[PDB]
Ligand binder design. Structure first.
Ligand code: FAD
Ligand code: R26
Ligand code: 2J3
Length: 456
């Protein structure tokens, strides 16, 4: 319906740029705009935008066009027999999860928030708590319809012709065109619940040992919080949450009558029940230690999505802190075999004088064939630093460390890394760029990130 000049940032609310934002529920209108941008030969180009949950500058285009895809949110079909869903790129994973449950179907890859679009999920090739067993979002896309620079709509599949373009679009950050529509293969489920095992470790060595002892193959889902502030040996201690989807006979009789129902997110969160924090005189001593170890250690606990998958939700408004501004989100992965190198990076972080509380630790499994896919088999870490003197130059050093240890950064979280660091981290970038130049010779699709990371 409308085109509007708008100041656009990522979720991190940093590096703002003004673009013409097109918001239409009409698909033929989206096709026309891309054809109009291409008629000039790609003036300053266009880029799709979803829900803006990426922290960086991948979903903005200063002095150019941004197409909002959220109004394109029709669920065309769900089929329980073939396990397939046909949805527009603008549907979000919360919406899809809600719609698919009554069929006994599960969204195969869920990120730490359900507010992301299908287009957004494919474009960043998002990963979730179950990566080691299921791969990333791209692994589960059976087909997609891509609007290219030439104004045509190409029907892509993971195998067969245009496979190269499919796998370039996966993790392509919108730089091969606009995903309009997609078929996802879902995971069959009989309940909307998990069976969980909790474990708490005392150190980083202990956290690594737990992930290396072969136990990870017993759980489809697995992730941890870790201590990034304490000095060794407390550095790297973890609360690990692992589990699998439950069967209906594994549910208590109470919940057996509605196995696939989703519980309404509660009104009262912890900040509302305890306004003045959780800490008491015991918290930071040996009794405090024992309490966390006991509460974080359990076997066969039945949990809903909110409990098992979104454990930050109970903590309400407290620590993000004031928002995602002003904090710098930083995520990387170090190859599995590089255990000593990974241990070094963690030590570098704690000695930096930059303090992160909100921490994710997860061991990734095998990678996919997308040349710009973020995930590789290894140690995935997410940290959250308050913007503060010396931070920029510190994370540049972290970049060097990650790069040197065979790892990489994640575009969905980045806003500040250099093109050189990035290109070295992604050794298949030239291969990907070649594909991009075949499908968009005029640079009809472009973004701040494309220009910054020299993927243009
Ligand atoms: C609280 C929080 C938790 C998170 N947890 C995780 C996690 O556990 N795992 C993980 O992998 N990520 C995570 N993320 C990052 C998030 O999953 C990605 O940034 C995701 O891509 C956001 O989707 P979106 O619809 O908001 O896309 P946007 O941020 O709006 O766009 C991001 C990129 O996708 C492209 N894009 C969007 N729609 C389309 C389309 N229709 N066609 C072509 N390209 C398109 C854009 O061009 C842009 O390059 C998290 C983010 C937040 C804020
Ligand atoms: N402490 C803590 C904590 C921090 C973040 C979250 C949920 N957010 C995320 N959770 C994430 C979870 C993973 C996982 F590895 F588990 F898949 C990977 C990346 C993630 N990224 C984010 C993000 O905020 O960008 C939950 C608890
Ligand atoms: C988002 C992710 C669950 O998919 O959470 C990871 C960390 C915070 O573990 C959860 C509990 C043990 O804190």
């Amino acid at each position: 319906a409308t085109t509007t000049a708008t100041r656009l940032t990522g979720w991190g609310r940093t590096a703002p740029s003004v673009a013409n934002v097109l918001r239409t529920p009409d698909a033929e209108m989206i096709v026309k705009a891309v054809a109009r941008v291409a008629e000039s030969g790609g003036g300053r180009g266009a880029i799709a935008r979803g829900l803006g949950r990426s922290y960086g500058d991948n979903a903005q285009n200063g002095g150019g066009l941004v197409i909002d895809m959220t109004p394109l949110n029709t669920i065309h079909s769900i089929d329980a027999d073939t396990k397939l869903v046909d949805i527009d790129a603008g549907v979000n994973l919360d919406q899809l999860m809600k719609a698919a449950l009554p069929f006994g179907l599960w969204v195969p890859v869920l990120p730490g928030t359900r507010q992301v679009t299908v287009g957004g999920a494919i474009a960043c090739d998002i990963h979730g708590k179950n990566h080691h067993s299921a791969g990333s979002f791209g692994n589960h896309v059976r087909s997609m319809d891509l609007l290219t620079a030439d104004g045509e709509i190409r029907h892509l599949t993971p195998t067969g012709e245009d496979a190269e373009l499919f796998w370039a679009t996966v993790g392509g950050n919108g730089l091969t065109g606009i995903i309009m529509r997609a078929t996802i293969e879902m995971t069959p489920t009989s309940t909307a619940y998990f069976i969980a095992d909790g474990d708490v470790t005392a150190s980083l060595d202990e956290t690594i040992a737990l992930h290396s002892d072969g136990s990870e193959a017993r759980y489809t889902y697995s992730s941890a919080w870790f201590d990034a502030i304490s000095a060794p040996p407390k550095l790297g201690r973890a609360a690990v949450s692992r589990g699998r989807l439950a069967t209906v006979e594994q549910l208590p009789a109470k919940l057996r009558s509605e196995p696939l129902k989703f519980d309404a997110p509660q009104l009262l969160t912890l900040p509302d029940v305890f306004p003045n924090g959780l800490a008491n005189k015991y918290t930071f001593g040996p009794i405090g230690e024992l309490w966390y170890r006991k509460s974080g250690t359990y076997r066969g606990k039945v949990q809903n999505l909110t409990q098992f998958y979104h454990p930050l939700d109970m903590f309400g408004e407290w620590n993000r802190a004031y928002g995602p501004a002003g904090f710098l989100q930083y995520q990387f992965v170090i190859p599995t075999e590089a255990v000593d190198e990974f241990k070094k990076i963690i030590g570098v972080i704690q000695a930096s004088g930059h303090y992160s509380f909100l921490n994710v630790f997860k061991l990734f499994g095998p990678r996919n064939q997308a040349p710009l896919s973020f995930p590789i088999p290894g140690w995935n870490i997410c940290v959250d630093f308050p913007i503060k003197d010396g931070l920029g130059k510190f994370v540049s050093e972290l970049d060097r460390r990650v790069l040197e240890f065979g790892g990489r950064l994640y575009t969905a979280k980045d806003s500040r890394t250099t093109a050189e660091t990035f290109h070295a981290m992604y050794p298949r970038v030239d291969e990907w760029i070649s594909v991009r130049r075949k499908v968009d010779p005029l640079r009809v699709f472009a973004s701040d990130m494309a220009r910054r990371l020299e993927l243009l």
